[PDB]
Design a protein around this ligand. Sequence first.
Ligand SMILES: Nc1ncnc2c1ncn2[C@@H]1O[C@H](COP(=O)(O)OP(=O)(O)O)[C@@H](O)[C@H]1O
Ligand SMILES: Nc1ncnc2c1ncn2[C@@H]1O[C@H](COP(=O)(O)OP(=O)(O)O)[C@@H](O)[C@H]1O
Ligand SMILES: C/C=C/COP(=O)(O)O
Ligand SMILES: C/C=C/COP(=O)(O)O
Lengths: 237, 247
Amino acid sequence: SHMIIIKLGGSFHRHIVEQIAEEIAQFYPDESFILVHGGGHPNAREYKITEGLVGDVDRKRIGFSKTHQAMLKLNDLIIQTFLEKGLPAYSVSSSSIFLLENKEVVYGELEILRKLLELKFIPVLFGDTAIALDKGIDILSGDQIVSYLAKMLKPSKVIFLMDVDGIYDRNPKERDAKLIEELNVEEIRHLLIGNKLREALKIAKHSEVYFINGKVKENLGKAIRGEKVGTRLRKLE
Amino acid sequence: HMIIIKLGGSVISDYSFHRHIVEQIAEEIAQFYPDESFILVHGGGSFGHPNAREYKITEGLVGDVDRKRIGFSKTHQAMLKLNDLIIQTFLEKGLPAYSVSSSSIFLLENKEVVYGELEILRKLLELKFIPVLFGDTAIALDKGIDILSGDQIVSYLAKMLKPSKVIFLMDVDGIYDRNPKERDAKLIEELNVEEIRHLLESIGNKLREALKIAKHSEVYFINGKVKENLGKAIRGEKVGTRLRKLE
Ligand SMILES: Nc1ncnc2c1ncn2[C@@H]1O[C@H](COP(=O)(O)OP(=O)(O)O)[C@@H](O)[C@H]1O
Ligand SMILES: Nc1ncnc2c1ncn2[C@@H]1O[C@H](COP(=O)(O)OP(=O)(O)O)[C@@H](O)[C@H]1O
Ligand SMILES: C/C=C/COP(=O)(O)O
Ligand SMILES: C/C=C/COP(=O)(O)O
């Protein structure tokens, strides 16, 4: 309905979080917002959590817990930044409501998020460690959380704040690239970032998708208002 | 074949830290893990209680609802901080404790859980993890925002998963005659519904939750500041107050 999901990339830059909160404050509270950020990941690679519950099991469990705690610290920093700006952002543990199989959320709990949104709260989830029915433990990325929430909650739009202006033709590092302001299935179906494109193809069934540069503040508001900004992938037909 | 250990807010804290007794509980549990499953619900402590009192969370979403939402989030963050302390302490002792946000799976009505999600907890206990829940802020359907105590969490988990025993760690050796402040008080070794009811006619919440829990599990009330007390409570040994399973 009148709900918007916002996903954040990677860097801790406090000023950019301040800008994101200030832009979100333009539509609170008559517009519902769910926030999702990413890594914590250093512990994810150091403990090879994606390897599963194989080999040294106890060390993998300890690293699972430590990575979750580091993600909680980063999430608390973001939460306090949002709270100082007068926004009631509430932390929701992703690993406490989600269960994966093959890097995909196959079990979820969403009544708590619904009651948070109803009471004019802003839930904030994170890419996190997670329990996986196949290989015991796994790393759940924020893109999968966004995909599941789009499957179930069906937001009005999903906005990805990236380090670059949006989806490009060539690699942004390889100059002479061009920006695609209007994205559709045929262009996304070019895979020779990729996982984000597959998740966007899955999400466009339910909601509009925006890819905008989070470094520019006003950008966020534009994507929420529907103005031309970055890359836009409309709802599929 | 599952044990639920509740840690009082006044034993593991009081803005004190009390890391020594947390290490003690960690070693006591390590004496039994992995051959046994443990859920640990730690109390509010000196972290979420001051914020809840200052922002008046238990009153609900009334008056200054914006400031109350801000205080809701701040209290949740303080409880997450204390949970990080406890979980790090449990991790350095070689035990795999994992955080579960109580406010992320529970929904309250009249100071008790009326909506819950336990599949994540089940999968955590299956994979030989130790889940660490805590008293928290909570979304209440009647008053909007409320404070969910660890006792109600333990009661809901007991009526849900049906553990073998539920062990409370308190400041005192267990349940006494009257207030242990009075000098003519004697610890009860075997509790029953009669002396319970006779005592409430004069903690209150602990006794109600224990009366509900005894329908599913055996209750223990012991002093958490002593080492072997937890281990004696894990077995059927005589320690503190014992409330046998209802029959
Ligand atoms: N065609 C493209 N358009 C935009 N970015 C691209 C493209 N190809 C590669 N990239 C790069 O891929 C990266 C995607 O960011 P990513 O690490 O996936 O974010 P997250 O960690 O949030 O998933 C960007 O930093 C960008 O430089
Ligand atoms: N009959 C009794 N037996 C034991 N403790 C009692 C009794 N009457 C009063 N108390 C006091 O009540 C307190 C109970 O604390 P409690 O509220 O259970 O802690 P928490 O807030 O962590 O649940 C104890 O510290 C104890 O001093
Ligand atoms: C613990 C880290 C999980 C991954 O986070 P993310 O890919 O970038 O959204
Ligand atoms: C922020 C409040 C948490 C609950 O406190 P508790 O009584 O002692 O379990």
